[model samples]
Target: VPQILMPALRQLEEAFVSAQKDPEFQAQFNDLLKNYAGRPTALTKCQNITAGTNTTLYLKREDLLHGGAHKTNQVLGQALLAKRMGKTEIIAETGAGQHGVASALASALLGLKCRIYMGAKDVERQSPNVFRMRLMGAEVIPVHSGSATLKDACNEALRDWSGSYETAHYMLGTAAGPHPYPTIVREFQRMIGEETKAQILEREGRLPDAVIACVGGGSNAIGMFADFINETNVGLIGVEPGVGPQHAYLNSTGRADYVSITDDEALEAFKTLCLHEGIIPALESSHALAHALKMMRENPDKEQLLVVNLSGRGDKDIFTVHDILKARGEI
Candidate 1:
């Protein structure tokens, strides 16, 4: 591994050592890795129809991991670490339920009490997963505030964690959070890339043409790319979900609004755009997704740009996009 990769490797090694030095925690991490995680997840070449795209594709195959998705990798590790710290309980917030299910699975495996905060709207929509978490012995709390979605659920989980600080550990799902969390979760999930590199070399006697993963909180995408940090030949591509501007302005109604908010001033400015006439614009007023996309675009060489299709209309964002489309049609 190159020196850039060494920082992450050393960090992971320290976390591993921390877990291992404590006998009980070591046993838990090791057991989850061996049995619950199905250690050494398979790396299968994408011999599927994508071969026609003129670029080689491969699947890290984390979806095949136990608990049905990549979230298992982090939750199992965190739950074990929590146990070592004398935490007897775990609580997590989830948008998709995949993370909640994985955390519940780990909690059950380790005999810790588990609770999950899920968006009320999502709980109703994702009924099958609700039933799955219940079967795994997790208490599900439904959040009904401020869009009744992921952020609200996260707030509730944080509140619960604060109230029960001693025995509770929050299993954050993504590669973004407070300092140690973003760093820690990414390290736990980096196994995907490490396994992918080894498998590709074994099969083809060379590195892959490219690596691609969907980016939500960017955990799996970042993790799988970590192992290939230095190889100039191996391209890295992160497939974000959509390509359209998240926010747009309308002249017909003389109103303006945003799809997402990055700061308070942006929020107030957007309100000003809609309500006030002839209020000269001072700052950028648009969707946060567009800003994020641009930032990612600027760092292409840091990763790579293979191709991205703005597929899968954001189901959660359907209302916003639909309203924009309606506005456009009127114009």
Candidate 2:
């Protein structure tokens, strides 16, 4: 929103509008989705997560994505868009490091200069991803401002772009930023829901009774929810942290339902998936999975179909969880 970056940002807007309509851009983007980012990520049926119930649970396996998360899906598009705009540098912000890792990877693939701002605390807790971004040649700066988390990193990334907009593109990791970003990220990420809807209908002959995903910045969930909009039977669900402006708007409009899950429940769900299904799930995704478990358990006889987004693998959080369980003597 700074005056210095207005003209550059306006140019980017126009460039993106044309790029969206360009066939070559879509072809290139689609190619990467298939060969690089692993598009059409599997739709897996769950055997244990909803065990002993009439309900059937399926998982949209975004965790199996090439970069191990949905973050890779949009970063590739944004990175390519940056190139199309003739930008030579990319700036990004991250919380748990998935965005930073994917942004770094996309930039590396595109041969762009990459810098990521991360919360100092996130850098410590998410060291593996810090290593990942650095390994792929991105310079990761730890921001000490604000709560020293995603918000702070976002602030720092925006500040950098305000000055460097001439040559740098601030690649937002989620659908929760100022104008153009949320819209752009949502479009790039719509494949998640489209794929889910296609796969579900193919396998089950109908839409899912409910689609659930965790809400942080809500990119992954919103992407999955987009295709099922204005539905009656197929419930669109988001488990806390009630995130972002668009998600809040969706819930406020009575179009989607938002639910809460405690940290204890989310962690337990994380362990449960690992133990039962042999799938290591990210804590963020586990919130939605936890809510799914709670739902099926309470209504064991309900004949319903549920789908949850396995947003990413939990390999990055193994150390963090170990420390938490260690202190709790639950390890």
Candidate 3:
């Protein structure tokens, strides 16, 4: 880490710690979660999708949350923190556009100036969400270097924050960034599992056999797994595009069983849920649902109660999905 970066990071760490113990900050943050972002998102049983399987499946529907994903939960919290820290601007990067939209919305609501950096390719592919961000008064910068993807966008955001640290907060969208970010995002998003635990106890009168969520930077998975980590009987699963660094950490720590899914499988699962459950999940989230459905089919004799986190809606992905289906001649 750059020596220049340490001071800002340390300041943020202390601010977050102080905010945790501040009652006024907590009340304002909770108010936004309930009134602005919509909390206590539903946990709906997948009766039709799991018709033939002996295992019962339920979806923790973060898809229903405002801004259409679990991203809003953390963004609102972070935005409030930015306010408390006296930051007047917000900077963030996005891959699939969900986080960008959430950040833009939170900034708009909180009266903070916002700028989002997205890879050039993603800017083109995720045009709908790009428009949504701009509509909500965020400036979207297209990063054209280094494959022009999530990593490149993140690099640009960090560069901007390096210079503007005093007046701006770099709102990292996932749980994979530097020290205080992962911890802060996890605390904000842990409501997913906290709610799931309560809802499951009320509905099923017991904890789930397993909790599953998709992992990009692992925010949703961490949030959904946080409350259940102490429950030894409940399994924790994280689905990803491939076995990357997160896989090693998750598996080595015994916090989650890592599962990888192919693009084709995720696409098929995306379509399956849309047709069967009337829920069009984000491509990132499709990976988790695909794994859950596959497990149910392969282990038909196991009577398991699984909770899958539907992290986001697929409206931003329709164009990408249509092109894939068309290329395969399945559209």
Highest-scoring model, TM-score? 2
Estimate the lDDT of model 2: 0.84
- lDDT against the true structure, per candidate, is 0.59, 0.84, 0.86
Candidates ranked, most accurate by TM-score first = 2, 3, 1
What lDDT does candidate 1 reach at residue 34? Answer: 67
Candidate 3 per-residue lDDT, tens place, 255-310, comes to: 78777999988987898898999999988889898998888988887988999988
RMSD of 3: 4.3
Rank candidates, lDDT, best first.
3, 2, 1
| Model 2: lowest-lDDT 10 consecutive positions | 241-250
On residues 106-225, what C-alpha lDDT tens digit does candidate 2 reach at each position? 999999999999999999999899999999999999999899988899888988999888898989876766667777887788888889899999999999999988876643677888
Over the stretch 42-118, how does candidate 1's per-residue lDDT look in tens digits?
65443332322443334444534444446787888888777766779998998879888998999998899999999
The lowest-lDDT stretch of 10 consecutive residues in candidate 3 is 242-251
Instruction: Quote the lDDT for 144 in model 2.
Output: 90
TM-score pick, better of 2 and 3: 2
Error of 3 at 326 (Å): 8.4
Model 1 alpha-carbon miss at residue 155, Å: 0.5
Clashing pairs in 3: none
